[PDB]
Amino acid sequence: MIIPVRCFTCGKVIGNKWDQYLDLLQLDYTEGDALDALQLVRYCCRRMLMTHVDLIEKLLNY
Amino acid sequence: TSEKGKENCKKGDCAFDQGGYFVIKGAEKVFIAQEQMCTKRLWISNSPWTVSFRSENKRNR
DNA sequence: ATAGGAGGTATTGTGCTTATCGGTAGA
RNA sequence: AGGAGAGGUA
DNA sequence: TCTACCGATAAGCACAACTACCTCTCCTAT
Ligand SMILES: [Zn+2]
Numbered sequence: 051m052i053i054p055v056r057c058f059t060c061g062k063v064i065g066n067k068w069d070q071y072l073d074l075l076q077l078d079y080t081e082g083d084a085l086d087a088l089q090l091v092r093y094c095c096r097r098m099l100m101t102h103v104d105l106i107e108k109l110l111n112y
Numbered sequence: 113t114s115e116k117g118k119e120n121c122k123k124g125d126c127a128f129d130q131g132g133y134f135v136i137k138g139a140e141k142v143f144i145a146q147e148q149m150c151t152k153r154l155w156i157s158n159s160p161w162t163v164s165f166r167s168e169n170k171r172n173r
Numbered sequence: 174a175t176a177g178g179a180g181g182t183a184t185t186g187t188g189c190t191t192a193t194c195g196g197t198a199g200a
Numbered sequence: 201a202g203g204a205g206a207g208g209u210a
Numbered sequence: 211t212c213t214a215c216c217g218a219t220a221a222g223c224a225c226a227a228c229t230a231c232c233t234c235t236c237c238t239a240t
Contacts, residue, residue, distance in 0.1 A: 111122055
């Protein structure tokens, strides 16, 4: 399951921000700071980028 | 499946079930715990008043 | 056609139909 | 096609 | 004094223990 594109609530393009979010989380950054660094002022996009689970890795492995 | 290698785990099971079922005819079968009275404790009942000693293996109640 | 000992245990619940069980009343 | 057994809806 | 039915006390026998429904699994001996 890849990151859901277009952010159903309010319709925001967030399909190309998952890699940046992972890179920010790899460093000494919290979830809130990482989401703020991606220029997201509405909590719908933050919820979409925070509640996603990476499932395609298990699909490829298994 | 138990104590399998990393390579063997990739191909096969989906790593979502711990394997508590049985394969009889292609359908998963799961046992359900059955609550049974303790056979190593003295049991006292009413109407009539009696005390019974349970049997472990042979019928020596 | 044959096969499937023997065990102390651990559904009620209402109607109905007996039997049996003494049980007095009459001649 | 008919049944038996389980999980279930209003 | 001996008949003659005549109400009580247990012992089994027979239905009744819900609607509309929807899926799955298993089944037909040897
Ligand atoms: Zn949004």
